[PDB]
């Protein structure tokens, strides 16, 4: 179920990551308004429900703008600078948690953001284009 | 024009069953306890309201509603009346040895 | 709740007005609608008319036409109806429903009936 | 192989109500606060609609189950209420009124306010009809139920069309048969944008400024030989009436506090004359006749009418609002006569205090119009109540207004609301590329 | 235009599915809010706004862990299970409307739309995560 | 910046296409609802945030039925009809800004928008289903 995975290893973890991506939004399984009835709650309601669009927006337009948008898993071409993590692959996906990974990487995150954005897919679509052009 | 019978046989587990003739016959049928107001046992020929118990149910067919009741009690002793919009049956009264 | 009180039974003289209330409390008082129904000891039930307490829009039967009236005050969820001309052969008990704890918008049968007035003219 | 393939963008749709949408026509004309029907925000609708019409389908409808007429109830009651909010109070006028006759239906009242000082009291006349004012001398007809909310004189009553519509994701289906019964299928159905003028008037026993029929008059109801359910017998053709309040009234201001303005009827100049409408006489005649044949076809005997029995004096009148004025037409010289330019003249009485709705809550004040009053009853329709537990040789069909969601079942039974599922699976050859 | 292929069979409507995609959303050709003005309609017109975006983004979403986000018809290699429906190809395509074909197939639709998450995009992901690592 | 290339030539401004694309739609940076408070502002600002959803989900509804979604830069195979622009490729990319082409052409782009739609991904979906047949 939905972070049923929270403690278990990267690996094991990263196979059931469909059905974190699926309550992020949904929202309307539960309800519509309601209108079954037609206050403090009715106000309440709608600030929760334009919240919920656009936390869910930006990661879908994060994942727009490094090109993966159709993708919950995508490799890159940005290499690693070790300045950011020192372990290993033995080291983090089998004997670590997701938890624990997001405490000690997250100072430099928005720049290794920045190098999604900028690296690859603002230098692989010009590339792209220039490719096409025969 | 809506006519049903006045008293027909019954045993306890025997079925008690009433015909019902006329135009649009038997949309609801009324268990009149000997004393108070009559209350509404079965609603469109077939369907059962709630609180009332399962051994109630109804027939329809072409023009004829047929009431039948499975499992009689002492308690059932009552008037049946058969209706049909503003209109309404005879009354039949149960007979039970 | 959701259940419909009539007044005490009574006895008449030809000729005179009786009037018998039906007060409904626990629902909705004005959503749904108040028929009045007769049922004479040793004949038929015979039904008399309706009124829906949104604006009273009374209905009845041409054998109780220019006889039964039925007003409201639906301040105290309070239904009337008052025969004017009474004979000796308006004798019956005199029930008030209404369709509240039902899924059929028809309109009947009826399954919410009052405690009973038995009117002896 | 047969492995799923999912298209979106599929033309498939489900039963299912969502909430509406006022979009009226491009006349932002207003230069007042006006128009308590469309109010400040109601968008401009499209000035091309999209009419698609649709064939290949039979779709069932429903105009009794439908929950736009539920919706658009809602929003009516809410619209009159909110356009009363702001406006004046009449709690100070809920005093004893000295009232002394004219000769009529009008009563000269003097009664007893306070002024903007919230010390000095002072005494003003004003002419009230009989039918505002219940005997105690006198005091208003429901100072003693609620309270009064005049209506703004800025603001008006005229019903603009204004048109329901769908939010993004829905559509609402459009049904075409000429001759349609309303419950059942329909073989012709359209997909529209939204909906046509549709204006929201209030009317007991005749549906006044709707839409016509084309082939024929349709009877429609729930269930006909049901007598609980009032019979909307919409009609083909539209007679014609002229509505009038012909005696001149001046509108005397009476001061009752800071910004609070009470509007009264002043002085009555010219002859007592009683508000009356002319609905021909012979068109009227061709339209019981062809309400009869249609009425007939249901039937097997001969049909007669009468007029209405009782009930409040809203519904045993013809109700209507004629230039902000409300209007109560006696409607018993139309069904007099039993079926199987000399014309009849309907005498309406005034009332200013309306209770409309029956809610209990506001009831507002409607003020007096300065000078002649004129308008236009056109007709597009008629409520009728079958008759009790009868004999097979004749049957009466009463007028009567019930539930005003029969208002806006003359107009809204075309339409249904229904949601787009763009989602759909379906099995085909193709096979994507394997990963490996 | 939009649903207009709702009566007509499935060959003739799959190819105008992009009319009744554009109309799901739109809405700001006929108002922005909207500031012309500056009551019931704008509580009614909001919660309306809210609701077209919030029922709209669950169909990409749905096509997004489905692998499908960009395209308006993608294909898989789930098989289809014959208790699902019996029929052809020729008595599907050029013979019925897809009208019919929700009626009877709505009761394991949820149950399908659980193979499309889990038996492709979920499997596709790590077999294209252990493809790409050579 | 944002908007900062507006009066480069399109080809310098081509390449600093990311930044503006992030602002239309955070956000969420400057502000969730927010409840640090909990009036007139608070309904001007949530018809804001509706709006900004509303139209950004306009142009990656419009880029998905052109089929690029995923991509900032798609190339199509609908050719350009010479009565809508007679200019060259270096008139236009290394002396021209954006901002004077749009002016002069936003006269047919409608169908223009409507050839994008139709000529390629209404083709390109129904050729490739017919490919992937076999
Ligand atoms: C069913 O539908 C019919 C339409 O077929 C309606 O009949 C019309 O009703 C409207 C509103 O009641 C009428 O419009 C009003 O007419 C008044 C009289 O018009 C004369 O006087 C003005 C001014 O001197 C002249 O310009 C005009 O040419 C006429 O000579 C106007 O006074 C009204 O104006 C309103 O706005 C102005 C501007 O703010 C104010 O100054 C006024 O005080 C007033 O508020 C208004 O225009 C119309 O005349 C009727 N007839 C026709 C043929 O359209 C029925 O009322 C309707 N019935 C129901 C029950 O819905
Ligand atoms: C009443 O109940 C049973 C079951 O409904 C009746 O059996 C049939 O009833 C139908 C209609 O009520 C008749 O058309 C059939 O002819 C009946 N079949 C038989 C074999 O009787 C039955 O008539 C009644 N039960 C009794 C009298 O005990
Ligand atoms: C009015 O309502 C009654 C029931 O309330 C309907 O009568 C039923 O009609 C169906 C077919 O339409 C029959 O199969 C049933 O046997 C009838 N009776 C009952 C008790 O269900 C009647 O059809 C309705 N009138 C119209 C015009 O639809
Ligand atoms: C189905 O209904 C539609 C809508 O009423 C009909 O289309 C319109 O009606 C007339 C008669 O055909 C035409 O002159 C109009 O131009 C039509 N409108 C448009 C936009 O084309 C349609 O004809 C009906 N079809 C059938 C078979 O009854
Ligand atoms: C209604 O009654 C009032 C009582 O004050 C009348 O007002 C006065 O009437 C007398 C005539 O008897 C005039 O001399 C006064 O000038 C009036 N006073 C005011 C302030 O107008 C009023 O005329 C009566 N109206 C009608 C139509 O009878
Ligand atoms: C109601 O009034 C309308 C106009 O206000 C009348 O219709 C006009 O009648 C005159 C002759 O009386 C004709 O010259 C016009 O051509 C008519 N106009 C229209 C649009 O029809 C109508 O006769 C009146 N009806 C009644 C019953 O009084
Ligand atoms: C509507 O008008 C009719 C007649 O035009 C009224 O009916 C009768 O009118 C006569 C006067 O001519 C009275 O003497 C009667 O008492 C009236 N009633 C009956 C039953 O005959 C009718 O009263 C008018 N409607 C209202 C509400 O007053
Ligand atoms: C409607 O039905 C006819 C008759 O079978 C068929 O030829 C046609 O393709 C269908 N669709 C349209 C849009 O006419
Ligand atoms: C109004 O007030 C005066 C004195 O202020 C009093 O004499 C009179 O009875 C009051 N009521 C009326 C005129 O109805
Ligand atoms: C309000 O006053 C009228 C005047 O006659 C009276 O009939 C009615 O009963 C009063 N209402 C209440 C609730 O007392
Ligand atoms: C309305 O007419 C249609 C005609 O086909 C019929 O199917 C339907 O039962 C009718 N409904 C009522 C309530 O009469
Ligand atoms: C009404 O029509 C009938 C027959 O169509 C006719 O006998 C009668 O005279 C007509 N009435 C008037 C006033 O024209
Ligand atoms: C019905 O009432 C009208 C109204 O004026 C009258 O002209 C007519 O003669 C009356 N007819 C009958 C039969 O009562
Ligand atoms: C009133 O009826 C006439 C019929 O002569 C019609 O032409 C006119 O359009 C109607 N008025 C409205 C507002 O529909």
């Known amino acids: 179920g939905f972070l049923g995975a929270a403690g278990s290893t990267m690996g094991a973890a990263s196979m059931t990551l469909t059905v974190q991506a699926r309550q992020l939004l949904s929202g309307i399984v539960q309800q519509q308004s309601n209108l079954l009835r037609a206050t403090v709650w009715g106000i309440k309601q709608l600030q929760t429900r334009v919240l919920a669009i656009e936390r869910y927006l930006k990661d879908q337009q994060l994942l727009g703008l490094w090109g993966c948008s159709g993708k919950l898993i995508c490799c890159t071409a940005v290499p690693w600078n070790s300045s950011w993590s020192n372990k290993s692959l033995g080291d983090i996906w089998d004997n670590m948690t997701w938890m624990q990974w997001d405490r000690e990487i997250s100072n430099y995150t928005n720049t290794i953001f920045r190098l999604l954005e900028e690296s690859q897919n603002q230098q692989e679509k010009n590339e792209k284009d220039l490719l096409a052009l025969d | 024009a809506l006519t049903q019978p006045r008293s027909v046989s019954g045993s306890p587990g025997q079925s008690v069953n009433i015909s019902c003739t006329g135009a649009?016959?038997?949309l609801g049928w009324y268990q009149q306890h000997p004393g108070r107001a009559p209350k509404l046992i079965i609603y469109?020929?077939?369907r059962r309201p709630s609180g009332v118990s399962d051994r109630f149910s109804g027939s329809k067919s072409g023009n004829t509603a047929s009431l039948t009741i499975s499992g009689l009690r002492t308690e059932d002793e009552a008037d049946y009346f058969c209706?049909?919009?503003?209109?309404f049956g005879e009354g039949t009264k149960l007979t039970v040895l | 709740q959701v259940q419909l009180v009539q007044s005490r039974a009574e006895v008449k003289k030809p000729g005179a007005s009786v009037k018998v209330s039906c007060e409904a409390s626990?629902?909705?008082?004005?959503?749904?609608?108040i028929h009045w129904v007769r049922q004479a000891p040793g004949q038929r039930p015979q039904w008399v008319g309706w009124?829906?307490?949104?604006?009273?829009?009374?209905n009845y039967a041409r054998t109780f036409q220019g006889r039964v009236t039925m007003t409201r005050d639906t301040s105290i969820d309070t239904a009337y109806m008052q025969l004017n001309r009474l004979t000796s052969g308006d004798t019956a008990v005199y029930y008030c429903?209404?369709?509240?704890?039902?899924?059929?918008?028809?309109?009947?049968?009826?399954?919410?009936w009052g405690q009973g007035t038995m009117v002896t003219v | 192989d047969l492995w799923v393939t999912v298209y979106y963008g599929v033309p498939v749709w489900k039963e299912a109500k969502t909430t509406l949408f006022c979009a009226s026509d491009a006349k932002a004309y207003d230069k007042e606060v006006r128009n308590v029907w469309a109010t400040h925000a109601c968008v401009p609708t499209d000035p091309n609609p999209q009419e698609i019409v649709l064939e290949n389908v039979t779709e069932n409808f429903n105009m009794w189950k439908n929950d736009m007429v539920d919706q658009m109830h809602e929003d009516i009651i809410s619209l009159w209420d909110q356009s009363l909010k702001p406006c004046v109070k009449l709690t100070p006028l809920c005093v004893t009124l000295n009232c002394k006759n004219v000769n009529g239906e009008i009563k000269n009242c003097s009664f007893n306010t306070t002024t903007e000082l919230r010390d000095k009291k002072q005494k003003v006349y004003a002419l009230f009809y009989k039918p505002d004012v219940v005997p105690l001398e006198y005091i208003l007809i429901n100072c003693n139920s609620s309270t009064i909310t005049q209506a703004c004189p800025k603001v008006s009553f005229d019903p603009i069309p204004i048109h329901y519509c769908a939010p993004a994701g829905y559509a609402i289906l459009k049904c075409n048969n000429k001759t349609f019964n309303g419950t059942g299928p329909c073989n012709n159905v359209s997909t529209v944008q939204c909906t046509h003028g549709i204006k929201p008037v209030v009317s007991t026993q005749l549906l006044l400024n709707g839409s016509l029929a084309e082939e024929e008059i349709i009877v429609r109801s729930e269930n006909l030989t049901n007598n609980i359910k009032t019979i909307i017998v919409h009609l083909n053709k539209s007679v014609e009436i002229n509505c009038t309040r012909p005696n001149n009234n001046t509108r005397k201001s009476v001061r009752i506090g800071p910004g609070q303005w009470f509007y009264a009827t002043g002085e009555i100049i010219g002859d007592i004359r009683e508000a009356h409408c002319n609905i021909s006489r012979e068109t009227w005649n061709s339209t019981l006749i062809q309400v009869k044949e249609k009425l007939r076809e249901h039937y097997n005997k001969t049909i007669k009418f009468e007029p209405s029995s009782g009930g409040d004096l809203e519904v045993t009148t013809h109700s209507f609002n004629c230039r902000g004025e409300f209007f109560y037409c006696n409607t018993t010289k139309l069904f007099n006569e039993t079926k199987l330019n000399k014309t009849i003249i309907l005498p309406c009485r005034i009332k200013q205090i309306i209770n409309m709705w029956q809610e209990v809550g506001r009831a507002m004040y409607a003020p007096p119009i300065e000078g002649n009053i004129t308008c236009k009853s056109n007709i597009t329709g008629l409520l009728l109540t079958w008759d009790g537990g009868e004999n097979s040789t004749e049957g009466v069909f009463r007028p009567g207004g019930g539930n005003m969601k029969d208002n806006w079942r003359s107009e809204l039974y075309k339409y249904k609301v229904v949601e787009i599922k763009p989602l759909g699976v379906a099995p085909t050859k193709c096979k994507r590329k394997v990963v490996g | 235009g939009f649903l207009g292929a709702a009566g007509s069979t499935m060959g003739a409507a799959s190819m105008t599915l992009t009319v009744q995609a554009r109309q799901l959303l739109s809405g700001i050709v006929q108002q922005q809010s909207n500031l012309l003005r500056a009551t019931v309609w704008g509580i009614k017109q909001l919660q309306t706004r809210v609701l077209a975006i919030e029922r709209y983004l669950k169909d990409q979403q749905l096509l997004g862990l489905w692998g499908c986000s960009g395209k308006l018809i993608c294909c898989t290699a789930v098989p289809w299970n014959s208790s699902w429906s019996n029929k052809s190809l020729g008595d599907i395509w050029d013979n019925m409307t897809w009208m019919q074909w929700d009626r009877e197939i709505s009761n394991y639709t949820n149950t399908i739309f659980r193979l499309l998450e889990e038996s492709q995009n979920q499997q596709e992901k790590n077999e294209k995560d252990l493809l790409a690592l050579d | 910046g944002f908007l900062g290339a507006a009066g480069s030539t399109m080809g310098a401004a081509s390449m600093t296409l990311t930044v503006q694309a992030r602002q239309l739609l955070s956000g969420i940076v400057q502000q969730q609802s927010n409840l640090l408070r909990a009036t007139v502002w608070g309904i001007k600002q949530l018809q804001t945030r509706v709006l900004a959803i509303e139209r950004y989900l306009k142009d990656q509804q419009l880029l998905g039925l052109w089929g690029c979604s995923g991509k900032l830069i798609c190339c199509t195979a609908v050719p350009w009809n010479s009565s809508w622009s007679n200019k060259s490729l270096g008139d236009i990319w290394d002396n021209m800004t954006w901002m004077q082409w749009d002016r002069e052409i936003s006269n047919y782009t409608n169908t223009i928008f409507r050839l994008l739609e139709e000529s390629q991904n209404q083709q390109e979906k129904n050729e490739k289903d017919l490919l992937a047949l076999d």
């Open positions: 429903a209404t369709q509240v704890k039902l899924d059929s918008s028809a309109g009947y049968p009826f399954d919410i």
């Open positions: 626990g629902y909705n008082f004005v959503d749904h609608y």
């Open positions: 009124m829906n307490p949104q604006w009273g829009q009374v």
């Open positions: 649009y016959s038997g």
């Open positions: 469109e020929v077939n």
């Open positions: 209706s049909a919009f503003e209109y």
